[PDB]
């Protein structure tokens with residue numbers, strides 16, 4: 001199957017540079033024009049660039065023309081996006097996409113890589129347990145910057161009944177959120193519950209066991 | 213550039229309803245090669261968009277038959293014949309006929325379902341957070357509808373205000389409900405000066421307010 005995986009996203013100071021990569025597999029990379037599309041937090045989609053499969057034919061919207069440069073290494077089936085003189089407005093998730101022979105633009109998308117242009121330093125979250133018919137338990141993920149943070153339960157084995165709330169900004173300028181799950185009260189004491197928190201920007205990985 | 217304007221900006225419909233979204237370009241969008249590269253995308257929270265329709269009316273591989281597109285010139289329409297719970301998302305039109313390629317602003321589609329009262333849970337601060345000098349008390353409102361809800365905190369029967377924040381999940385893809393979290397933040401000192409903590413919930417589905425609490 002077609003796979004697109006972006007990487008390189010991070011927290012960068014205004015004016016600095018960042019280089020994004022998109023590794024592909026499952027199709028003949030050298031036969032397709034490739035694209036980059038981005039999405040600012042809470043905003044819509046915006047086409048960022050395109051590049052021919054060969055011949056290096058490119059184009060960008062005026063918002064990034066002169067600052068962003070798309071490139072590719074057909075021998076490695078990888079697409080790149082060099083972003084220079086980054087601005088706060090460039091903040092968002094950057095997607096790599098491929099169209100189809102017959103006329104579509106973004107038929108296949110990668111998962112996206114987050115880019116945050118900020119003057120502030122990255123900060124990892126603190127994680128606390130939310131101690132528990134059916135019972136509710138969870139984890140409080142507090143004081144981190146920037147988004148995103150991912151929370152799984154029992155390493156992905158527990159998904160039903162899980163609710164990870166959208167992060168909310170606190171007065172400190174830092175995000176906080178809670179992730180909860182409802183399970184049978186009869187399971188309390190027989191099954192272990194662990195929330196796996198991953199904050200990629202700060203490479204913070206926390207595993208918190210939640211007990212009654 | 214070519215402005216793509218979608219109508220409406222958002223809407224709600226019941227499962228089984230026929231939904232129609234429109235997109236109008238500020239200029240004609242017929243590519244020099246004669247094709248009209250108008251596409252519709254679907255995006256659910258946290259995930260990459262998914263192509264549904266391209267070249268105005270062609271359904272992408274794997275896309276359910278309930279989705280379709282049409283139009284010409286500067287007016288196009290996207291239609292879901294029979295809405296299903298999993299269709300909750302933001303839909304976008306896109307034009308690739310003239311550079312710069314542009315997207316519509318997006319149309320948020322929610323599902324209208326029967327009222328459902330929330331299940332309420334309250335969580336006291338963890339022992340490890342307390343030794344940090346702060347206490348977070350959490351109140352969870354699980355699986356309710358509509359989105360509107362009222363949460364009020366009470367410490368030793370005293371009404372709290374200004375020391376809480378709330379968050380609401382995206383509408384569930386299976387049961388079309390919402391969940392809400394309210395977090396009361398106090399200092400270790402304050403928290404340890406009181407015994408009874410409780411959150412009072414008011415909602416359309418509840419005949420009377422529900423209160424959950426605990427004794428420190």
Ligand SMILES: CC(=O)N[C@@H]1[C@@H](O[C@@H]2O[C@@H](C)[C@@H](O)[C@@H](O)[C@@H]2O)[C@H](O[C@@H]2O[C@H](CO)[C@H](O)[C@H](O)[C@H]2O[C@@H]2O[C@@H](C)[C@@H](O)[C@@H](O)[C@@H]2O)[C@@H](CO)O[C@@H]1O
Nearest residue numbers: 031032033050053098099100101102103104105106245308
């Ligand atoms: C598989 C592939 O990459 N084929 C390209 C083709 O791109 C494909 O078709 C276009 C219309 C678009 O849907 C792509 O996503 C899809 O991969 C190239 O077409 C050009 O693509 C660029 C970038 O999107 C512009 O859209 C450009 O106008 C396209 O050329 C026009 O459409 C072509 C089908 C021809 O009619 C051409 O004369 C038009 O100007 C072509 C470019 O030669 O190269 C591969 O075939």
